[PDB]
């Protein structure tokens, strides 16, 4: 964990975080953070290895308003796993359909709530045969991810905002 705070630049920080997650079985991650009282998702500090095309489409299509993982993070500090049942509206189902196309079917999002009011999300996406297997994979490393999201929050907020 230490290496995240004693890293020095965003490039290096992002690599380390990507490697920690990868080491926990996750090939794709996203770390997004907004400062206090903000809503400018355009100017949101973003880190990880989501497909670049998905990221740009996401941002263009205003999907942050449709993404149930985002609304959830505004309302809780607890993780949300990407289950069909979180995608409820037609919009959300079509978002689900596209997101699954970019290779984001299975995963979870840890809400991020910082000391200085920072708001964010750390998502981990995993590859598996089915949901039952994906969930086993995630559940096995869940207490580590839980520590990791707070470590990432503290060090990344310092990067993004100091």
Residues that bind ligand K4G (CB under 6 A): 30, 32, 34, 41, 44, 46, 64, 67, 69-70, 73-74, 82, 99, 104, 109, 119-121, 123
Site residue total, a second copy (CB under 8 A): 21
Do the beta carbons of residue 119 and residue 74 sit within 8 Å? yes
The DSSP result for 81-133, as a single string, is: E--GGG--SHHHHHHHHHHHHTT-SEEEEEEEE-TTS-EEEEEEEE--SSHHH
The C-alpha atoms of residue 108 and residue 124 are separated, in whole angstroms, by: 6
Pick from a second copy, ligand K4G, none: which does 113 bind, CB < 5 to 8 A by kind? Answer: a second copy
Pick from a second copy, ligand K4G, none: which does 70 bind, CB < 5 to 8 A by kind? Answer: ligand K4G
Distance of CA 145 to the CA centre of its chain: 11
Of 78-97, which residues contact a second copy (CB under 8 A)? 78
Q: Is 151 in the site for a second copy (CB under 8 A)?
A: yes
CB of 94 to a second copy, least distance (A): 27
Q: Is 77 in the site for a second copy (CB under 8 A)?
A: yes
Do the beta carbons of residue 106 and residue 128 sit within 8 Å? yes
CB of 61 to a second copy, least distance (A): 25
CA nearest to 135, candidates 78, 84, 72:
84
Residues near a second copy (CB under 8 A) are 73-78, 111, 113-117, 142-144, 146-147, 150-151, 153-154
């Amino acid at each position: 964990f230490l290496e995240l705070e004693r890293s020095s630049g965003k490039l290096e920080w992002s690599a380390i975080l990507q490697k920690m997650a990868s080491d926990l079985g996750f090939s794709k991650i996203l770390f997004g953070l907004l400062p206090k009282d903000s809503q400018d998702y355009e100017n949101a500090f973003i880190v990880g290895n989501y497909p670049a095309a998905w990221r740009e489409h996401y941002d263009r299509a205003g999907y942050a308003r449709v993404d149930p993982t985002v609304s959830h993070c505004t309302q809780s500090v607890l993780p949300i796993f990407w289950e069909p049942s979180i995608y409820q509206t037609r919009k959300q189902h079509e978002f689900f359909e596209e997101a699954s196309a970019a290779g984001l079917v299975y995963g979870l999002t840890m809400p991020l709530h910082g000391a200085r009011g920072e708001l964010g999300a750390l998502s981990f996406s995993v590859e598996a045969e089915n949901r039952a297997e994906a969930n086993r994979f995630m559940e096995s490393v869940l207490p580590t991810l839980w520590m990791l999201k707070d470590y990432a929050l503290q060090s990344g907020a310092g990067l993004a905002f100091e």
